[PDB]
Amino acid sequence: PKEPEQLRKLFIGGLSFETTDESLRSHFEQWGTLTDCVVMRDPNTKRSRGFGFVTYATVEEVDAAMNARPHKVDGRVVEPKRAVSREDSQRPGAHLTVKKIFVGGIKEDTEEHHLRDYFEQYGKIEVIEIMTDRGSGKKRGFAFVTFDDHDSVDKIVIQKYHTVNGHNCEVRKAL
Numbered sequence: 001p002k003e004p005e006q007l008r009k010l011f012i013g014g015l016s017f018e019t020t021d022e023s024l025r026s027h028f029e030q031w032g033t034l035t036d037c038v039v040m041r042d043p044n045t046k047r048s049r050g051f052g053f054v055t056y057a058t059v060e061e062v063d064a065a066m067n068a069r070p071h072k073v074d075g076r077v078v079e080p081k082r083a084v085s086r087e088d089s090q091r092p093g094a095h096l097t098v099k100k101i102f103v104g105g106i107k108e109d110t111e112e113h114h115l116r117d118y119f120e121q122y123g124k125i126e127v128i129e130i131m132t133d134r135g136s137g138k139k140r141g142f143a144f145v146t147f148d149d150h151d152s153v154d155k156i157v158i159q160k161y162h163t164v165n166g167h168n169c170e171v172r173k174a175l
């Protein structure tokens with residue numbers, strides 16, 4: 001019944017070196033129950049590595065925290081990011097932080113408003129590009145959507161399914 005823990009974590013980059021497990025928790029508990037919260041430190045010096053992780057009890061709590069950005073934690077604006085699968089990563093353990101998606105499988109009957117009406121609930125859209133053939137102008141059956149922020153893309157690509165205009169679509173991070 002609980003969402004997988006991986007989908008409930010936020011990496012928090014850019015921490016003040018004075019941020020502690022306790023102060024990171026106090027801050028992020030404003031948006032949900034935290035089942036875990038840790039500042040990464042050097043194993044010998046105990047000096048902060050400048051990043052940490054928080055784990056919420058639910059995905060809706062992750063969303064609430066992301067919607068409350070920018071977060072100023074102990075005087076410094078931090079960089080929260082949610083996890084995505086390796087298929088949308090540039091190397092194991094690394095986050096491909098992009099604002100654009102490829103949307104495939106939309107065929108020739110899908111229009112800009114279909115993509116806008118669906119994707120606007122993931123984030124603020126800046127560009128919709130329905131791809132057409134360079135020679136004929138016919139729709140090629142794929143599109144790109146650019147958002148104002150990467151978390152929209154991260155939420156999108158972790159869904160198993162996207163149904164747009166009745167088509168089951170393939171969605172991936174782009175560039």
Ligand SMILES: CCC(=O)Nc1nc(C)cs1
Binds near residue numbers: 010095
């Ligand atoms: C530095 C690597 C990185 O960004 N790690 C991330 N972990 C999660 C959980 C999201 S991004």
